[PDB]
Symmetry: D2
Subunit: 381 residues, 4 copies
């Protein structure tokens, strides 16, 4: 295989991949424009798409990503499970790299919230989880190696595509509101029913109907779950406060190579506010206007759901702007790629089937550019 | 594992299993009543559910079943592909038993048309395919080992559940009619579209839209396929003539153990005709009446879609009736188990969620009885 | 010229959608495919109609709407009611089937399920008015709907209820009226108020209509302030024991009206004395049937799927007399309780259960022929 | 009292569903959410209506239905037509918006897409009758619908077409009228004739209504014998060049009627001289637009998504005069061709394209205000 470290692509919020997608549904990594996993494999590259929770928190998604790669049964931590009120153990993953350990590395590419998930999992690998450490010391038992800390030389690169490193007003003012969270969780409850084949990612909260449980008792049982009031969900983590908590508990690993990509899809109106361009995917037309009418000017330019000031880099970690041809092989610092003009949040993954300005060849070059950069990380070591 | 030979369960017509089922859809092997693959594994048994074409012919399904077990890329045969006008190569399967060969055996359990599929594939293993042999002699190239013949000691048992060994009038008078076949194929065309994640089993006929092909050209392209007029489809094979072709080209293997199971779900009206019982799954209410009003009396009693005279055994192969406690360890002869009164065609697989007379415990005992019989085949050898 | 002197008005229950207001594929409420009540009764020479009123609203809101369905005009829920519960005073405009409806021109009212209660409340309005609206008009002026004035009699010739939860149902107390289930119902109503929706689930007076230029984000935010989420002014509450008893405690017998109830039983005594649903109970009531059948009071267990037998026979302490199915049911001022129908569940009364082939259409046709023959005998004996 | 002396009747095109006959979630045909034509024009004081006619039927079947939508009564397709094409003679009964419609009481007719052709054919019926029905009645007797007699004038004041394929469209010849696509349309019609369906796709005169007691198996078998599967008496054929030309060759100019066309262009000249769809063309016409734009004759390539420009301007060899958008359009007996609207695709005329935020509602409101102002000027100048 042409890349020496496996590339793992990490979908964001709402993402469903592989056989976990519904019967008719767009293919997350590339749409019908560039089938990323398919084609990059055809070109001789070793690539994989992680399947992690679509509605869960960054913490819960970061744990699940680790088991997708390593294999095993998900262990969210005994302290975490106790503090937020959900199950400790989850799905079991075969694992794309059973012998993943210090020495065998991966490249991590994340779109949207996948970027935040990749950061939080590397943090656990490097610095551990101090609550699970204090718990395992005080009550014995077993601790997942994800929370032990001390592990290095396992992640070669972290690359983010339209990742809300600083959150988004579309979460604060819409997605994290009571009424909207109730809609998301009602969808999860329904997709937990005993006929359902797709996992929306919150079954650790109880959203799995048992085969001889009536829906009436299912409603009654899960209405007592702590999810309805919890911050351990994706909608909270995507808020400005939610993302600042993650910025404040993560740090730069001097050995990893960091890159961000950002799209802008708005245009300035005669008053200074930003409105979605035409061809901004129609489902983000309203969130784009919420972001674009912020009271702070520097928070207005956006890709539909992420303001540009959020996508460029975390606001408390160091960064350096980079041109499109400048080798992005620096380690320990966020290299901020030039904002791609005209790309909305989902043009990065090709699922905007209504935008005939964004064609396949363009997306193939973009993903070939990312792979090329990663291959240069491998050679400069 | 408690069974020395793997058990492979083979769904019938319309069946979708595993991650090939739509988002909300009943689980084929057991419904919500007894999760066959799940539970039998829990009990220490090695079991698998084959995923073969849901609308394809017995020939096409038999080829695909062989590759599901052995692994590899489906090869329908160069003569067959040329004669019926569809692709020669199909899906690639990982394979549950890569080293399957004379010496390592499987048990085969088939529901409905899966029974006919299991018979046709064993026939190929034992006696080959004379057309593919004559073709490979005349044009060289490669022949699949499925069509070579001479292979024995690879199938320990063949068990059928409500299998239409002699066809069904529900195919002759409804499912194989022009108008109905056009509906089935239109569904396959639509499920071939570029957003679709589920394989209905006729893509070798061209029913896969290419990613940059408009639906308008897709319609135009596949309207030229030979499927619309072909007999190489499931609806033809389930007809009385269709099944008699299969009976006339299969034979008993003296070393395999053969068993049939049959349900009756009709009751006799005051004129001699048969009407569906209440609790006969409502989607077979009309087909049940078509079968039950046949002009021949012995063709009327039925399970909803298969007449009892069809399910008991092929009409030209030898048989012996057997009690429910009689050891069914005889080889080379169809052992006809006692007709289960009150079971319709889908009570055998537990998906009749509207029949509260058919409970889980009853289905668990049935599948435990089949496994027990198979374990006795293993020990008497 | 119609064979019945007074029009028969059939009034659907909770969740019922009729006529053009039903989804593109959806069963036909009055008769399913088994006996098309309106179609077939019209073919026989009878003047019959299908009222269309709120599927999820309170008995009060439904009773007002039923009056305007018959009379015609813009729905007026009352200024006092609207201010008390926090919804709009005016609703839809109806064409009206009897624009001339007035003392002397009567109707026969036939209600299924909640329809039975709605029909009772509308007659209370005609005879006695609504005390709170009368007092509001006396203190503030303005216009008062004549529905709320009282004194309007000889407008209803009969009231016939089929499987009506006169005394409530535990299926509402223990499930339908729970917090989680009211949220689901109200979410469904929010969604079918969206700007592309053609069907009216009956709660738009609470704000559940999305404006043409309003985003769904802003719609969600506007209606989340509606008092419907915490209000008792809805069907789920009125179907509880307390809700139905409040109606029982504010209605009275009209001595000129012919009252008749029909009741089904679809359960059987299990081993301990509890009731479980029969084979063939429509499967959507399998769990509600068990909830009712396992009540702690034994007299409350026998049921039709969703309505206990003791609730359908008659309002708790209103006068009643048990009748045989064949004797004349022309007594006035008293609930004539027809014998309990064995094997009929709650929806066997309206034929929509297409899965149950045991209940054929001829039998449902005889059942409606019986009601019309009874109604024709009310007319002949006044 | 209405500001327009003659009612305006808007007539939808192919596939159009209006009012209560549309699915539970489905865009509103006349104006989308951008400008609710009927609602807003009524609010302004204008008497306007939304005709409801067959979505998939021929121009002939639609023109008959339009007449009964206006006049009232049971649709009579004609004994001769019914015997020739093999469908039923009688269809639905309409309430009628102008039961009094008769020489002296006029209407303004405004058609979008196929609606433009339907409106033309109905006026031919009123003025000249239908020769084949007249001859059938002379030879066999019986009753002949007055729609088919001829001699009924001064009933139509104006005919206005918006994006009407007067001369056909290659989108029908090369796609919509193909064997495979007609089968899909007819299958959709079979299915929405099923016994649970509430929406009428316009082909039930061909047998596509499942009886209440008939199994779907038997329904499929009965309607598979219908002549609709091989008939030309349907919209798909009438929208081809030959189909539209047959209508052109059997219509004539009425000297008292005011004729007006509007046309959109949504394509741009590609590198070779072919036309490709603009960014913002409604995506369902992306492929049809390219089919039209790559025609071998250059004058046939410019298009709005589904109708070529040369087809919308006016019927091929019927008299026409090009007008500016501001001059009085009160000439009678001649197609007044309004200037081609740049950037408007086929559905921008009716506002249903919710994805295209560039075409806002104020602009669509001005467009309908222009039509009504033109219609009011027809009335003032007679
Ligand atoms: Ca875009
Ligand atoms: Ca059954
Ligand atoms: Ca029933
Ligand atoms: Ca447009
Ligand atoms: Zn968690
Ligand atoms: Zn084949
Ligand atoms: Zn109210
Ligand atoms: Zn016709």
């Amino acid at each position: 295989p042409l890349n020496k470290y496996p590339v793992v692509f990490v979908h964001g919020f709402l993402g469903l991949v592989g056989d976990n997608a519904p019967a008719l549904y767009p293919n997350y990594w590339g749409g019908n424009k560039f089938k990323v996993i398919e084609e990059l494999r055809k070109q001789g590259y070793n690539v994989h798409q992680a399947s992690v929770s679509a509605f869960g928190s960054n913490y819960d998604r970061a744990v699940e990503l680790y088991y997708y790669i390593k294999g095993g049964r998900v262990d969210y931590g005994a302290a975490h499970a106790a503090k937020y009120g959900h199950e400790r153990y989850g799905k079991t993953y075969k694992g794309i790299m059973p012998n993943w350990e210090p020495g065998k590395k991966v490249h991590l590419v994340g779109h949207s919230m996948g970027g935040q998930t990749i950061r939080l999992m590397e943090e656990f690998l490097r610095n551990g989880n101090k609550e699970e450490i204090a718990y395992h010391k005080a009550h014995g038992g077993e601790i997942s190696p994800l929370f032990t800390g001390g592990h290095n030389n396992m992640v070669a690169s972290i690359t983010t595509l339209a990742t809300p490193h600083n959150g988004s007003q579309a979460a604060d003012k819409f997605g994290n509101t009571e009424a909207v969270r109730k809609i998301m969780f009602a969808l999860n409850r329904f997709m937990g029913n005993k006929y359902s084949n797709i996992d929306l990612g919150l079954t650790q909260w109880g959203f799995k109907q048992l085969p001889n449980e009536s829906y009436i008792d299912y409603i009654k049982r899960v209405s007592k779950s702590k999810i309805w009031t919890s911050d351990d969900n994706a909608a909270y983590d995507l808020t400005l406060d939610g993302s600042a908590k993650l910025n404040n508990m993560t740090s730069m690993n001097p050995n990893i190579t960091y890159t961000t990509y950002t799209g802008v899809s708005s245009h300035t109106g005669p008053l200074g506010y930003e409105n979605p361009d035409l061809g901004t995917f129609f489902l983000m037309a309203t969130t784009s206007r919420i972001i674009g009418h912020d009271a702070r000017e520097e928070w207005r330019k956006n890709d539909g759901v992420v303001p540009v000031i959020s996508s460029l880099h975390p606001s408390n970690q160091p960064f350096v702007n980079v041109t499109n041809d400048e080798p992005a092989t620096r380690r320990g610092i966020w290299q901020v790629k030039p904002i791609i003009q005209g790309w909305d949040h989902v043009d990065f993954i090709g699922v905007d089937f209504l935008d005939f300005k964004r064609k396949g060849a363009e997306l193939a070059n973009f993903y070939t550019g990312i792979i090329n950069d990663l291959l240069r990380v491998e050679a400069t070591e």
